Amino acid sequence: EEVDVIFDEDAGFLNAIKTFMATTKRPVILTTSDPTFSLMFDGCFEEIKFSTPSLLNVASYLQMICLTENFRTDVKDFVTLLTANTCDIRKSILYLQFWIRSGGGVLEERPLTLL
Amino acid sequence: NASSQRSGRQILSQLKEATQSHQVDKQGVNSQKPCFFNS
Amino acid sequence: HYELPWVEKYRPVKLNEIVGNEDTVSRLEVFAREGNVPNIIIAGPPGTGKTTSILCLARALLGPALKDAMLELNASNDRGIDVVRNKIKMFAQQKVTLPKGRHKIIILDEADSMTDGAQQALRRTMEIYSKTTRFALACNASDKI
Amino acid sequence: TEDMLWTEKYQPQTASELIGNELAIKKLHSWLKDWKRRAELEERQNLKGK
Amino acid sequence: MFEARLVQGSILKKVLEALKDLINEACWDISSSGVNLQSMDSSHVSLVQLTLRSEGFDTYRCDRNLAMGVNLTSMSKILKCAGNEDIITLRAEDNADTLALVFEAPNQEKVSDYEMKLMDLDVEQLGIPEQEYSCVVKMPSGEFARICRDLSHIGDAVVISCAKDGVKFSASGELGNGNIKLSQTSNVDKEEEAVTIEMNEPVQLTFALRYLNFFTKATPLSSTVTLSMSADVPLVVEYKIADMGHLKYYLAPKIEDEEGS
Amino acid sequence: MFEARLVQGSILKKVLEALKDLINEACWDISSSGVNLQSMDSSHVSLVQLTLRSEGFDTYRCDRNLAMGVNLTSMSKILKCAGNEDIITLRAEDNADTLALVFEAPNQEKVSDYEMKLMDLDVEQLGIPEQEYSCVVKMPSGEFARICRDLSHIGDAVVISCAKDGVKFSASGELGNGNIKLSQTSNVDKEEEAVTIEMNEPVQLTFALRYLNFFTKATPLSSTVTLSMSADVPLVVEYKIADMGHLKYYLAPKIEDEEGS
Amino acid sequence: MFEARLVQGSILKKVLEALKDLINEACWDISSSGVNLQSMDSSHVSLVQLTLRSEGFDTYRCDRNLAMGVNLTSMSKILKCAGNEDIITLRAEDNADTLALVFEAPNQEKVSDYEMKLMDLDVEQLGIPEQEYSCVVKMPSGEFARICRDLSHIGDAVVISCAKDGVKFSASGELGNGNIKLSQTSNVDKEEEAVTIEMNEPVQLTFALRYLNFFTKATPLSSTVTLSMSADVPLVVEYKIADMGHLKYYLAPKIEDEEGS
């Protein structure tokens, strides 16, 4: 986890992991957030890219989460929250946990069929 | 993790046999995740 | 006999006595009342009441175990790589018997003086021990984190 | 009465429960299926040898 | 509420120097029968199971079963001041964050009290069930350490191949190949260097060399060693602790990349 | 006009490594009574004092009182290349800015001479009266070194307490608490010293690990060391070098605060 | 098809200890007459020579000669697990890259079956003069080792003069000129032990302490050793076992640099 984070205490880490991949017989997974690690690192490795997830899907997922905790909430509020977090799932989930367990923001009725 | 000590000699001496051998406990409590460290 | 400064002679001891940012005050009040608080980053102007709110929240949530289940770091302490390597992980792994829903608490006073690699180390530690340990931090400029 | 965060409360147990990046999780799941199949075949080879 | 009065602390010294770098924490599972330790190493491919019987201690008291995870670096520090001949007191409360080690120095009154917190392990006891071992070996202590160090001087992977005579240890390295055969040296003056074999079938496995070195670092505590090895099982290296207890070593064999015909 | 003849350079090497990290510079003042050093820390929390009588040197000569200041780092660089068995000469002129170290030949074939510039600095004579201490003990130096380096890796600070029962060391570290208790009946066998008290009232104070470790860097000077300790007047570490002089150390305690309700 | 059978392990275990860090390669010339070792230093200063006879070995078998080459360190590691009373047997094949090593059992039924990879280099021929020497002395081995170890503390080059008064070993270095002179008479618990001189002209040269210390590591082979010294040729030391062969080690002199006049 975070192969990109290297300290002076972490001496010879890239050479070390080079030796690991060189001599392994078990699966090894490297994860990071920077795109630059792909170019500076030398070796043979399969690449897997996670794109930013779709806003409406994670909005529906967060809305199911708040529905399970006995809260009904509009989609557009979660869309604003996600775009404010640049669609970060853990940020939106944690702030939703804080804002739900605080008792909710504003009690306003909204009759929607698409209580 | 970067939070733990990850120097080359230490990581090689305490993690090579994870991929060069079998697992001593292949049954029972196996789906736990020990964070590898050296304090 | 000593002239205690009024800034600490009249620092509030209960959360309701703090004014300003009243919505977050009520949210901190209900989290002090019930518990299972998430990790908190308070950001604002200096002298607003951030450290006061954090310390009063910790006191209300812990009680008698405030000397043991609570630990504090400020810029006066080391706060380098080696301490966020050893000390905070040792506490986050450390066993403390607590009432239900109550977790061990670490306060990072004015985290804007954390070095970047110190935060890079702190991430895994704060995220894996979330079952028994919660973190609270204060800062003035959020971009320094 | 809970003592644990929503991130680990609604932590996905299954790769199908992840949201978004469907192609990436299928590639990763297929790679790990291939590797566990290789490990199982090596185990079968070990029992066949002895 | 737990109290142990270890009649001698040097055995704790020897077992900890056996495990000072292999395993990362030490777990004490404590009941009426005694003190148990089920620790699986940093690579989690070898297991150490240490059992101390209640009669071995000067006093033993256990009101309820207790599981304490303790940092190994901490105990490795505190015990380097412990004397070669001494009494040690393990102190543990029922539901506390504490573990006290009381050292009575050979002075009239020089009490050293080290209090350590608990590292809150979520991993419980782990151990294999009892199984018939086709290869049970009574073998000596010191010469095992000599031949492990010779194999270390030769290679880094160990070929264990038991046979009708005994067992053969092979090591093919870049420097060279070294193969030492041990067999029935039972007819000898002392029973500790006597080698008697009650094996069932010849079976070969291969193992990590450095681990065998750390496990044979515990040589001088026991006069002899028993080995329990068979097919598809960890190698077992077990020592008997005279009038205190018994210790067990489990070794997962090296994975082999067998090639299809 | 100043001549001093250090009988053995081992003592000078030992006191230098005892104070190598403590102080920025060494300012000695010389009188017909002898040589004195009362230099107080750059972090301003401790004072080193060393008084050496004139008769301790092989030949001690003075014309007047002189206070000279020498940078410590180059002084260490010069003295680390001197034999311990050697007889040393310290020569100082009346008004020159250079001090001469005339080492005799350690190899009996090459007399060495080194020079040092003088560094002017404001040095005050911290003339503290020697008040009666409510706690006085004598206890061997090597043990005090081993226990400070024991508690240093435990704690960032040590709680000393002196009572009628004995002298007591606590250190509440993050790994846990470390306690050492001594007794007056507790007599050691390493250097054959019976720990004694001349105390009057129990007292508890707290001192940092770093300074005390570098006070134990003065271990080889004397077999036993005298600790003087009071409720207000701070920690005194006193080595009595045989026929050379006495080496006093003043360390102030950390403040203590009561935890809020 | 070559197979050599040495009767006790006391021979190889100490002649190789003499060559612990002298020559990087053990170079054997295997003939039907016997084994020879012709290995030459990388510093162009020291030559080593062994001639093991067929009569000394238990049984000697040769089908063809060998330019045999063995790495030193791995052979030492194989040697370190040889019994002192055990029979050494070594096999070299016609074309294989393995050197088999089978020893008698140190545990009386625990035998070894070792291998050794063969390394192939230039194996250049080394010429021995087989000349006459101006001074030959029969000398005790352990006392020579004592003198060499006593003079090794002082410097690096020792001057050696052999005359009718005997040998004179002086370490003219830093600590002092340690003068050791042995006459013809030497009285021990044995009936005779003579440092006897059979000379023509008095010789005076200079040798190195490190190679002499390496040469003295062959002490237990022969209680009496023949030292040969002439004006221009290197020092020859010859340990005669009187049944195995002769250890002939040659050390080139340190030429005194002639300063200009």
Ligand SMILES: Nc1ncnc2c1ncn2[C@@H]1O[C@H](COP(=O)(O)OP(=O)(O)OP(O)(O)=S)[C@@H](O)[C@H]1O
């Ligand atoms: N909202 C408030 N209500 C009551 N007292 C307050 C409030 N804000 C500040 N104080 C007082 O002023 C002191 C400073 O409070 P702090 O919480 O330390 O300030 P801050 O908001 O944390 O920003 P800092 O300390 O500059 S990082 C407190 O100890 C109180 O005595």
Ligand SMILES: [Mg+2]
């Ligand atoms: Mg603040």
